[PDB]
Design a protein around this ligand. Structure first.
Ligand SMILES: *[B]([O])([O])C1=[C]C([N+](=O)[O-])=[C][C]=[C]1
Length: 263
């Protein structure tokens, strides 16, 4: 597999495993490397979380506008938006934007509670035809990224296929699809990952995940090249040792090879 060789060299230099799946929605061309292996979701589940909330909001009038007056008991390390708005409260929309664009942990747990926990989010993903995704735990425990542990994992392919359905397909009603896309486009945490691999004039929406341990980090994105059909892709990493470091540069490099390999 000559197409795969640059990915193999990249993961070998990295000292771990890289998983990549990219699809050009105009041509149907794909690029695949370890595309069907499981990788920890880490914070990347927060994108799909927001999508599941949006789906619910279609059936529950004023859900996204509803103020949540959470207490300090809801707060978790690295919840900068939720801590800032503790004395104000936040709407469901605002919590979703915080989870997506700042990877806010408390906001993510608050929204998970609304869906009936990790099982509720998993059930939503099953409803759109994703049989791979599983979320089992809450923030921060879901980040353990233990090699061989299937909890809180998906595959680059399933992540890409689900992202396509939600952002470009018919899984959400149109206004809700647009809100999801807009939240992804406003992400603040991904500037050194897939965004670093894309020509500066192309629009990008992404969600990052960073477990930290076991060299485990990731990003998925929808990319709109000027005047062409969008591309959807996912890049996930992991490594065998607890103190192995993740690398944003490796994620960006894998993204570049994916865009180059497309037809
Ligand atoms: B997540 O579960 O990768 C995650 C993200 C952050 N963050 O500050 O972005 C902290 C802890 C877990």
């Amino acid at each position: 597999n000559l197409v795969a060789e640059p990915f193999a060299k990249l993961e070998q230099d990295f000292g771990g495993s890289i998983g990549v799946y990219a699809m050009d929605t105009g041509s149907g061309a794909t690029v695949s490397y370890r595309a069907e292996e499981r990788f920890p979701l880490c914070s990347s589940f927060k994108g799909f979380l927001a999508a599941a909330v949006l789906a619910r909001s279609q059936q529950q009038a004023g859900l996204l506008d509803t103020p949540i007056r959470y207490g300090k008991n809801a707060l978790v390390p690295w919840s900068p938006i939720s801590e800032k708005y503790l004395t104000t409260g936040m709407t469901v929309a605002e919590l979703s934007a915080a989870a997506v664009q700042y990877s806010d942990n408390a906001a993510a747990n608050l929204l998970l509670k609304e869906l009936g926990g990790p099982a509720g989010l998993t059930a939503f993903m099953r409803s759109i035809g994703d049989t791979t995704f599983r979320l089992d735990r809450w923030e921060l425990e879901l980040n353990s990224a233990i090699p061989g542990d299937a909890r809180d994992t998906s595959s680059p392919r399933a992540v890409t296929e689900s992202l396509q359905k939600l952002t470009l397909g018919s899984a959400l009603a149109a206004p809700q699809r647009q809100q999801f896309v807009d939240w992804l486009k406003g992400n603040t945490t991904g500037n050194h990952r897939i965004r670093a691999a894309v020509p500066a004039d192309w629009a990008v929406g992404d969600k990052t995940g960073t477990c930290g341990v076991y060299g485990t980090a990731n990003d998925y994105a929808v990319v709109w090249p000027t005047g062409r059909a969008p591309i959807v892709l996912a890049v996930y990493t992991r490594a065998p040792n607890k103190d192995d470091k993740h690398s944003e540069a490796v994620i960006a490099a894998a993204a570049r090879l994916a865009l180059e390999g497309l037809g």
